[PDB]
Design an enzyme around this catalytic site. Structure first.
Site, PDB file in Angstrom:
ATOM      1  N   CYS A 168       0.858  -1.195   0.000  1.00  0.00           N
ATOM      2  CA  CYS A 168       0.000   0.000   0.000  1.00  0.00           C
ATOM      3  C   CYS A 168       0.893   1.244   0.000  1.00  0.00           C
ATOM      4  CB  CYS A 168      -1.015  -0.051   1.137  1.00  0.00           C
ATOM      5  SG  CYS A 168      -0.300   0.019   2.802  1.00  0.00           S
ATOM      6  N   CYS A 202      -1.614   1.100   7.152  1.00  0.00           N
ATOM      7  CA  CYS A 202      -3.073   0.858   7.287  1.00  0.00           C
ATOM      8  C   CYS A 202      -3.434  -0.463   6.603  1.00  0.00           C
ATOM      9  CB  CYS A 202      -3.923   2.024   6.780  1.00  0.00           C
ATOM     10  SG  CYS A 202      -3.617   3.623   7.570  1.00  0.00           S
ATOM     11  N   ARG A 203      -3.371  -0.519   5.288  1.00  0.00           N
ATOM     12  CA  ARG A 203      -3.964  -1.633   4.514  1.00  0.00           C
ATOM     13  C   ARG A 203      -3.055  -2.859   4.429  1.00  0.00           C
ATOM     14  NH1 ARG A 203      -5.219   2.075  -0.613  1.00  0.00           N
ATOM     15  NH2 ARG A 203      -3.367   3.017   0.337  1.00  0.00           N
ATOM     16  N   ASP A 254      -7.874   3.744   0.630  1.00  0.00           N
ATOM     17  CA  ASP A 254      -6.978   4.275   1.680  1.00  0.00           C
ATOM     18  C   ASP A 254      -7.808   4.783   2.849  1.00  0.00           C
ATOM     19  OD1 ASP A 254      -5.013   5.520   3.182  1.00  0.00           O
ATOM     20  OD2 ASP A 254      -4.354   6.804   1.525  1.00  0.00           O
TER      21      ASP A 254
END
Ligand SMILES: Cc1ccccc1-c1nc2c(N)ncn(Cc3c(Cl)cccc3Cl)c-2n1
Length: 155
Positions: free
Chosen positions: A10, A15-16, A127
């Site tokens: 990412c 985060c991802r 996102d």
């Protein structure tokens, strides 16, 4: 020795992609095939290098009983040479990875959107940097569905 490898990517690797990596690692660990796999995640950007996953992502993984331990790192030239699959989250990630892949010595990796594996056809894993807990939950569920499908059969 591992014979299969996947790198989840990412923008920030906070985060991802740490979530996708953690979900995938739990599948192969519970199925006692983790010794066959190299599983990792990395960023297109150097911005977050050294940082742990976002606390919204940590909270989401704790709720779902998924172990997660990661330090953000930026993708390297070596990663294109060594991974079988590089699975990314959105169209900007895919453009950035394809551009970098065209400028390195060896690209062994197949570079694809992770969401291309979703049986529920939610192609983009968006996102969630400015998002709420529901947005992290959506990302987690996309990762569950896509990681299961990828482990069953790669494109
Ligand atoms: C701020 C922002 C605007 C439009 C699209 C994406 C983002 C956006 N998402 C991000 C995410 N998930 N994690 C960390 N950052 C911090 C960051 C900035 Cl300030 C600038 C370059 C790279 C990074 Cl990684 C993010 N920034």
């Amino acid at each position: 020795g591992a014979t299969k490898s996947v790198l989840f990517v990412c923008l920030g690797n906070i985060c991802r992609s740490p979530i996708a990596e953690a979900v995938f690692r739990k599948l192969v660990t519970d199925q006692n095939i983790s010794e066959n796999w190299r599983v990792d995640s990395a960023a297109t950007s150097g911005y977050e290098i050294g940082n742990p996953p976002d606390y919204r992502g940590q909270s989401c993984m704790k709720r779902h009983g998924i172990p997660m331990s990661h330090v953000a790192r930026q993708i390297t030239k070596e990663d294109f040479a060594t991974f079988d699959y590089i699975l990314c989250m959105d169209e900007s990630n895919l453009r950035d990875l394809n551009r970098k892949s065209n400028q390195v010595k060896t690209c062994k990796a197949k570079i694809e959107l992770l969401g291309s594996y979703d049986p529920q056809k939610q192609l983009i894993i968006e996102d969630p940097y400015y998002g709420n807990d529901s947005d992290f939950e959506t990302v987690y569920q996309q990762c569950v569905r896509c990681c299961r499908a990828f482990l069953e059969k790669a494109h």
